[PDB]
Amino acid sequence: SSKIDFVLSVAGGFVGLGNVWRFPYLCYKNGGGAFLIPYFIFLFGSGLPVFFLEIIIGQYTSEGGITCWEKICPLFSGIGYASVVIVSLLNVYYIVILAWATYYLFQSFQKELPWAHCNHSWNTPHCMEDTSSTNFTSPVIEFWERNVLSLSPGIDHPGSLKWDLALCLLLVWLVCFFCIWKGVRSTGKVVYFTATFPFAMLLVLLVRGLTLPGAGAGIKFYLYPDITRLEDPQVWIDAGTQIFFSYAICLGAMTSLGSYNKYKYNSYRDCMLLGCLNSGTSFVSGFAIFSILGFMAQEQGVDIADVAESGPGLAFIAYPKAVTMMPLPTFWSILFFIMLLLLGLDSQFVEVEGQITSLVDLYPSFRKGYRREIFIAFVCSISYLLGLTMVTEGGMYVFQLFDYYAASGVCLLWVAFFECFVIAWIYGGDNLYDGIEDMIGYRPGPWMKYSWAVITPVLCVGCFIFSLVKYVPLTYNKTYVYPNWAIGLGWSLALSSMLCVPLVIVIRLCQTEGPFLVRVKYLLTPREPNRWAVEREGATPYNS
Ligand SMILES: [Cl-]
Secondary structure, three states: OOHHHHHHHHOOOOOOHHHHOHHHHHHHHHOOHHHHHHHHHHHHHHHHHHHHHHHHHHHHHOOOOOHHHHHHOHHHOHHHHHHHHHHHHHHHHHHHHHHHHHHHHHOOOOOOOHHHOOOOOOOOOOOOOOOOOOOOOOHHHHHHHHHHHOOOOOOOOOOOEOHHHHHHHHHHHHHHHHHHHOOOOOHHHHHHHHOHHHHHHHHHHHHHHHHOOOOHHHHHHHOOOOHHHHHOOHHHHHHHHHHHHHHOOOOOHHHHHHHHOOOOOOHHHHHHHHHHHHHHHHHHHHHHHHHHHHHHHHHHOOOHHHOOOOOOOHHHHHHHHHHHHOOOHHHHHHHHHHHHHHHHHHHHHHHHHHHHHHHHHHOOOOOOOHHHHHHHHHHHHHHHHHHHHHOEOOHHHHHHHHHHHHOOOHHHHHHHHHHHHHHHHHHHHHHHHHHHHHHHOOOOOHHHHHHHHHHHHHHHHHHHHHHHHOOOOOEEOOOEEOOHHHHHHHHHHHHHHHOHHHHHHHHHHHHOOOOHHHHHHHHHOOOOOOOOOOOOOOHHHHHO
16 A cells, blocks of 8 residues: 555556557567567657547547547547447457457366367377477467367358357357446456556566577577568558557547546656556567567477467467466466456457447437446447357458458558647647646647657658558468458458548538538637637648
8 A cells, every 4th residue: 555556556557458469479470679660669759649649638628539529620520430430340359359368268277288289189180299390280379270260261261150269259248248237346456466467477478488498599589670671661560550559549448548537637657657668568578479489499490480370369379388388387377368368358348438438428328327238238249240250260361351451550540640630730739738738737848749740640641651552462371362352351441441531521511501611610610619710720820
């Protein structure tokens, strides 16, 4: 009950599901240390500024993800809607990951781990024990492929959903619905098991990562950046996506959190601490993952680049292999699975609660008694239906598609650039300065102004231009080539969320009555000073 423990408990859970799952696979795909530089560049130039901006928006507007924009600038309020849609797409695969962990939980209660040996039913005759095996013939990899997912030849015929994954996803969705319906009262102490538990586990891995034989090669590879991959543009796209995924920005959840936060909240310290802790956690996770990969390369003899899958699910391949080497593998495996499940459940709770809060703030009584609860189910079950498409036999391809196009890609970058352009240019930097000064009692420095006005919008524009101009066909584990129609489907899924901005703009422009300048300025000016509209904003707000 000390001051330090209190100020630590005040700060929410810095650990995230993307830090333990998405960041390792992204770092392994991007080459290791070559990915660290763009990640740090985006965290310093764009991550923390956008995080602070969204926290300030939430704390000042005291509204959801959409109503805040209506209060700030109705013309671009459609942006908020798009964000909500993205959230849904996120869940479409996010909760699915939890089901996987759930299955591993039921596999963690045996004396002998299933991924330890090859002498099993689901393992193919090509399975070779570590005591060598190829990328697709390792015991843990064979287990993860042909016992949890049960991959298909391709996305042309996904087949029927697996009953095990279906039951796991159903149970997890029931837990998620009951946590909101009955309510969770153990939050005040849940940090004691959600905040301290992951980091310590990483320590148990880190001390083990340096202890694993043959891990020096993976560590030396991780500490060697490659300039040829830096010249390539996909690393920058992956870094910009991972920054937004880790900081949870561009999803409107941080806006709802700031709205729920008190008015006299010093957001600068929170933003700085969260950024530093996320950077440190990502560095430690990458170090441990590459140590594990070096150990696996030494044990199997294959090249470090060809050790495991260069795609989603790298955690379920890397962590059990390291736990098997640890003494008493059952205990550490159960601890890691419980920690991962709790982190993912907390992230899903936050995202779903933010989305429901935004949709209930936009449409009234769509939050009156039972009306607030039933709608929740109307979301969850529907998502569960989409979750079915991900729990199919060849559902990993649809999972990769939704991860690359639906909830990531050009969509998040476009939405973030538009938010920054509306706040800095349309709304005004001086207005935001005065708002922050009235809120927290201090005026931010010129660095935040230059980042919100020039650095972040131009950086996002360049990133999205590099993404659109130079595009590579999506592949799965560098072995399966997605069909031509799959690329079009992914682009259509991305454009469905991207086009939400101009459509609402045109709708509001046609909705407002009056001259053209009046029609535009009634949507540009906030709803609060809606007495008479200055048809031409002077050069003073724009240049300054
Ligand atoms: Cl990250």
